[model samples]
Target: MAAQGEPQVQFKLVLVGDGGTGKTTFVKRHLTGEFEKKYVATLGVEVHPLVFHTNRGPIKFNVWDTAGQEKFGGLRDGYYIQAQCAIIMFDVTSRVTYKNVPNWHRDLVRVCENIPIVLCGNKVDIKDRKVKAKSIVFHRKKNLQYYDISAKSNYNFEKPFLWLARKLIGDPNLEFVAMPALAPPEVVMDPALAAQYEHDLEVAQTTALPDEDDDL
Candidate 1:
């Protein structure tokens, strides 16, 4: 393995929630009704090589995200087949986005089977927060992790990435070796919300939640 000398490990992470659901669920769960097995994207999605310069070494992830605005079409499960991990992201400002978390997890579990998965509710810095701490309970079920972030405020931005990175590296103690190429915080988080974010994570841990509906 050292012959190539590229120590950086690469993980294919299929950002999920929407994809081919019916076919996969049928194949993985219903068809066998007992046995669990394998199965396995692109278009409608773009692959970004997110390289984290960690204290131990640099790790890489090809994050698959929706491109050109068609979030639920073109590509879905097709991109998840090879994903070693995933991050189910949604906008906290919109209830519909939170409602679909379970479905995305469903799609991810259907194809990827077992992989480190994280849930991130974005737009945490928005003026109005629709999804509250108690309601943020999806991660409580199916062995998942939860986090919230805001690009503007830079709140918890790298935590989710680092958490995902930790899972892939089997290093819970991993630290970023480089960062902050320093983009100063554009929008700062509210004092109240900042503390609430920590509490939310704790609350999410104890509460188990799933998809209420697939309005998408």
Candidate 2:
């Protein structure tokens, strides 16, 4: 049986990478429950909201799927509003995309502050490989969570997503009592909405503050 009370907090994860690195495919498979082989270049950005139940509550992922085209860079930050988390993706088969990870990381950190981020090396299924352990080591030097995954095969895909969720909403895998923090900081003046965020927090905060009392 599920817990009686849980917090329903919306999470935002932004995907950043060059074109044809499977950003859209990654999101479509995870969020919409469908994957397509067709290479569809996202124009501006696509917002996909998926509600998945977790220990804390029913969590909603407000993922902003961005275009890989460099020209669309101007419109990137527009999606960062209220984005509590992010996942920067790159295609392992394409050395160029992997090389651009640092740039993408820089861009993401510029917009989002202290919000958790996961660095993903996409398209590990491809046999033609340009990525190597050295690249992984470099990413590790940056102190970011890195994982190589294939959107088509769904390999290691959930790792980054759940890690980001764990960082963003803490733990949604279990119900309220397992949660450590029961209330988010007072934001907005609406009594009803504020009360809801707190009620959800109380159930999750059953254990401890999860970490420090960021109490969000």
Candidate 3:
């Protein structure tokens, strides 16, 4: 609970990933309907109050976007100082993007220990087998919630926030009072692909990690 002029609950959400991984696009998709095809260069870091209207009032995650090298020692952990939770995203089509997730995860954990984190694979709208179930071992190894999202297609766009809000409020039965469509889908997600994602997710969960590696 906050004092006057503040909502019931708010958490600092750090959104980190490699450049061009669509972090900015994701937040703006929820705020502004028009996701201009060009990159909107920002300063050191970017932030927006992402609020969800719910039975309990407005739950907000003041989202913080990591710029060029924040996770690679850019701001020296200043941006993650008060972080309460985070979403570490990577492009599903690029092995390099996903490979760097461990560093990002450790960066956040170094600053905010034991915070609830979500591992997101973006660009799932791109219909291809580039994203495999084995590549998703990081989330399982670290015990983080995982989701397949498409900032361009609006597929499962709210799942990350839904889980985060429920966890933050300490209520398993919480629900955000319905929301208006933030924007019409930039690209439509195919039902077939969506089903495949579900199947792959289950497969990834069933898969296991090699015993030698420390973490993903």
Q: Considering TM-score, which of the candidate structures 1 and 3 is the better prediction for this target?
A: 3
lDDT of 2 by residue, 113-183 (tens): 77787777777565564664333443444556666566776555556766776666555454322222212
Q: Candidate 2, after superposition: displacement of residue 144 in Å?
A: 1.2
Candidate 2 TM-score, C-alpha based: 0.67
In order, the Cα lDDT scores of the candidates are 0.61, 0.59, 0.74
**lDDT by residue for model 1 (118-189), tens:** 777676788787876657656655667776666556577567778888877777888987652334566788
> Judged by lDDT relative to the true structure, which candidate is superior, 1 or 3?
3
Alpha carbon deviation, residue 131, candidate 3 (Å): 2.5
TM-score of each: 0.74, 0.67, 0.83
For this target, which candidate reaches the highest lDDT against the unseen true structure?
Answer: 3
Of the pair 2 and 3, which is ahead by lDDT?
3
Model 1 earns a TM-score of: 0.74
Candidate 3 lDDT for residue 153: 85
Per-residue lDDT tens digits of candidate 3, residues 164-210?
88887777777778773576788999998899777756654555442
Q: At residue 66, give the lDDT of candidate 3.
A: 57
Judge candidate 1 against the unseen true structure and give its global Cα lDDT, from 0 to 1. 0.61
